[PDB]
Design an enzyme around this catalytic site. Structure first.
Site, PDB file in Angstrom:
ATOM      1  CG  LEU A   1      35.710  35.776  36.514  1.00 19.15           C
ATOM      2  CD1 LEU A   1      34.733  37.213  36.752  1.00 19.15           C
ATOM      3  CD2 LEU A   1      35.150  35.199  35.196  1.00 19.15           C
ATOM      4  CG  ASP A   2      40.705  34.867  31.629  1.00 17.67           C
ATOM      5  OD1 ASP A   2      41.343  34.044  31.914  1.00 17.67           O
ATOM      6  OD2 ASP A   2      39.802  34.741  30.739  1.00 17.67           O
ATOM      7  CB  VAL A   3      44.007  40.066  33.970  1.00 16.48           C
ATOM      8  CG1 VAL A   3      43.872  40.142  32.453  1.00 16.48           C
ATOM      9  CG2 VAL A   3      44.622  41.327  34.391  1.00 16.48           C
TER      10      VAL A   3
ATOM     11  NE  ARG B   1      41.847  30.747  34.473  1.00 19.26           N
ATOM     12  CZ  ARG B   1      41.669  32.091  34.257  1.00 19.26           C
ATOM     13  NH1 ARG B   1      42.476  32.906  34.274  1.00 19.26           N
ATOM     14  NH2 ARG B   1      40.389  32.516  34.367  1.00 19.26           N
TER      15      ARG B   1
ATOM     16  CE  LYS C   1      39.435  39.470  37.705  1.00 25.45           C
ATOM     17  NZ  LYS C   1      39.605  40.357  36.613  1.00 25.45           N
TER      18      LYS C   1
END
EC number: 5.4.99.19
Lengths: 230, 230
Positions: free
Chosen positions: A100-102, B154, A68
């Site tokens: 997973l975060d941005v 989340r 990612k």
């Protein structure tokens, strides 16, 4: 059509009691709406979500690892999503086994298997996730012990679970955690007086991100990797 | 001088066990630096912090309500702080009983009483906080039920505790929560598919922000208000 709880139990690999509890804990949605009754009848015209992951009505057994990039999220639907890296109809059959975060890069597991993904993200199984963390300032001598002992963060009722810190150099470390609280890694180092400027996940359990994958590229998992993760 | 753990226990109002745990978990600082040894000796001149709130050795009993403006933070450390609104040495002997983010406005309680403030923000306690929330997109009918029944965010293992939402108009609502999870209000609305673009706290417990206070202005609490928060 069939009952929501029957669907959740069979597709997520839970007992009917566990499925019922999940529903009670607001973990289940039908077409984006939180549903608190396991008796609600559903059909293939409905999109069913467990902990916000879209479950498929036609499970076949597909597992992939994606590298990612930053600037995208792990939602099926503000920012582009990781599903842009897959063609349809494959893209529409998958969900993730740990988001997973941005701006976090690295290993994201995609699958159409809700039982497999849940086992991976279930707190009970406490699956280990390792991140390459790059810091703005140099690592301090107390970091390793703080991570191992646990850190009480503002907004949390409990300290972070013991985590393993490996120092690579003055600005990079590997941090292995068996949980995933909201922006956990960023908050941990911020609490220690530093700042995370880079976050890259490269390992989940004993499965390592294929270093030949460019950002946006993915490959199917091997049977060995699939089995090791559960 | 006395031990850091004795100071924390007596000032914050914790058992010796709780104080020891907090210190081992990096939640305590001496003069801005994290100290994990409860036996470390401190004097009245040392500045002790519990989760970044500056404590006062010799408590005199000061309690104030401030109408916080945007552009300032609740701490002693990127932006100016709310303590700029107080003159020294008073400004250096106060801490808050519930912090607000840089661009969140409204009610902030300042005090030198560690036990009083701790009880207000303690996860073990359920002190209510009410916010006027302004949203980017229109509110939805089911917002009230969602907040009342719990939302699974989340990063959390359990859904949010029962909260009360009152719809004011198409883009504004009042939300009362008795929890203090990290960026809880913003995350709750994000989970509902919206975005907080305005946030103003006007009530803590049964104490309402004095409407006559301009932003940046504060006034001492009345004995009645102090007791209502006890």
């Amino acid at each position: 059509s069939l009952r929501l709880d029957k669907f959740i139990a069979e597709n997520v690999g839970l007992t009917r009691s566990q499925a019922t509890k999940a529903i009670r804990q607001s973990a289940v949605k039908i077409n984006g709406e939180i549903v608190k009754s396991g008796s609600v009848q559903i059909s293939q015209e409905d999109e069913i979500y467990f902990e916000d992951e879209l479950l498929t009505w036609i499970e076949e057994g597909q597992y992939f690892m994606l590298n990612k990039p930053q600037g995208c999220v792990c939602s099926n639907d503000d920012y582009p999503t990781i599903y842009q890296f897959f063609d349809y109809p494959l893209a529409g059959k998958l969900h993730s086994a740990g988001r997973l975060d941005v701006d976090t890069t690295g290993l994201v597991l995609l699958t159409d298997d809700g039982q497999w993904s849940h086992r991976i993200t279930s707190p009970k199984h406490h699956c280990e996730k390792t991140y390459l963390v790059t810091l703005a300032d140099p690592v301090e001598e107390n970091y390793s012990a703080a991570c191992a002992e646990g850190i009480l963060l503002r907004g949390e009722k409990e300290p972070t679970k013991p985590a393993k810190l490996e120092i690579l150099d003055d600005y990079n470390v590997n941090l292995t955690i068996s949980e995933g609280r909201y922006h956990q890694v960023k908050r941990m180092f911020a609490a220690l007086g530093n700042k995370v400027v880079g976050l890259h996940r490269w390992k989940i359990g004993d499965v390592v991100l294929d270093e030949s994958l460019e950002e946006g590229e993915y490959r199917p998992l091997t049977q060995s990797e699939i089995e090791k993760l559960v």
